[PDB]
């Protein structure tokens, strides 16, 4: 479809709204410029003509060789820590005759990665209140997508959008996400380096949603250290880094990750205590949280909802907590029945008494 006009160049398409039944409407935008780039996405910024609001437009080739679940997964998602899909449409694009999907998302200016990179260049540590706020909101988005059976499979600091004025975090980049069905196998070399769970590095095809929890544990540890905790160009390199921290996995832990490795005689490396991994001033509660996330056995990792109930986030449940810029914290306690379905009795902890209003 598409068309050009003048207001600045105005683009008009017939786009389908992200929510509700399929009822496309004319949508006009202007002020187009290329902003972000990923391994698959090419994100434009634009300004909607009606409301003046800023949006991001991820334009992705619709490769029919691969499973393109991204639109179908995003359409069912509505949560305050997941970037909203306002509209989508199809356009002819640039590759002669080819099919390009356009996702019109809420525009969010920063990522956890770019914020953490400022502190590393300045040799400061990200203040712990932000580690708490950012990690808490991440786990809350994971509890939401996992309650639908959906695994993100690309959790990493570049995929976490921040509005740093409000400290609101939004998960994005669902182009690797999948609805994991037990008994059906999954492609194994998924997730980005530094954030791959050990069962994935061992080539497991029968993994679960808890790979996202391992990835979240790597983000947390990175935020606390100021650099990735398991760097490495290859799978062996990263597994060495994991083993130099957690120790050599037992035979039973190897069986939980991938039974095809249980008969090899790996050298037994002693674990490095978590208190020595991190800086001497690191809060003990963050270390305890990190050690219950970065676990070899996938069923022994915290679920995302259980992570939100952790004592590390206790300061967020104070009525008197304020952000460093003076504004109050974002909404943290408006849990639905859907995202509590994992374990409903955690509402006793997760909604503190001053927020039942």
């Amino acid at each position: 479809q598409m068309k050009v006009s003048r207001d600045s160049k105005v683009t008009t398409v017939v786009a389908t709204p992200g929510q509700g039944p399929d009822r496309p409407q004319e949508v006009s935008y202007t002020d187009t410029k290329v902003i972000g780039n990923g391994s698959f996405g090419v994100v434009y910024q634009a300004k909607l003509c009606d409301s003046g609001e800023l949006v991001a437009i991820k334009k992705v080739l619709q490769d029919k060789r691969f499973k393109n679940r991204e639109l179908q997964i995003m359409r069912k998602l509505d949560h305050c820590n997941i970037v909203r899909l306002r509209y989508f449409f199809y356009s002819s694009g640039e590759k002669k005759d080819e099919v390009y999907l356009n996702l019109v998302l809420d525009y969010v200016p920063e990522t956890v990665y770019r914020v953490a990179r400022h502190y590393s260049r300045a040799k400061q540590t990200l203040p712990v209140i932000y580690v708490k706020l950012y990690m808490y909101q991440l786990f809350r988005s994971l509890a939401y997508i996992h309650s639908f059976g959906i695994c993100h499979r690309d959790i990493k600091p570049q995929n976490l959008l921040l509005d740093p004025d409000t400290a609101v975090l939004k998960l994005c980049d669902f182009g690797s996400a999948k609805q994991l069905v037990r008994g059906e196998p999954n492609v194994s070399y998924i997730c980005s380096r530094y954030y791959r769970a050990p069962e994935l590095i061992f080539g497991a095809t029968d993994y679960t949603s808890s790979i996202d929890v391992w990835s979240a544990g790597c983000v947390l540890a990175e935020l606390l250290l100021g650099q990735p905790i398991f760097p490495g160009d290859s799978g062996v390199d990263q597994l060495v880094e994991i083993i130099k921290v957690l120790g050599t996995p037992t035979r039973e832990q190897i069986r939980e990750m991938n039974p095809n490795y249980t008969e090899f005689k790996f050298p037994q490396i002693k674990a490095h205590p978590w208190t020595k991994v991190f800086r001497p001033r690191t809060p003990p509660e963050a270390i305890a949280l990190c050690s219950r996330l970065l676990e070899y056995t996938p069923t022994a990792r915290l679920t995302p909802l259980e992570a939100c109930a952790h004592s590390f986030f206790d300061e967020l449940r104070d009525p008197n907590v304020k952000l460093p810029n003076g504004r109050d914290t974002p909404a943290l306690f408006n849990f639905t029945t859907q995202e509590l379905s994992s374990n409903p009795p955690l509402a006793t902890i997760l909604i503190p008494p001053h927020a039942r209003h």
Partner: peptide, 6 residues
Amino acid sequence: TAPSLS
């Protein structure tokens, strides 16, 4: 990092 074959 990429999704599954169809």
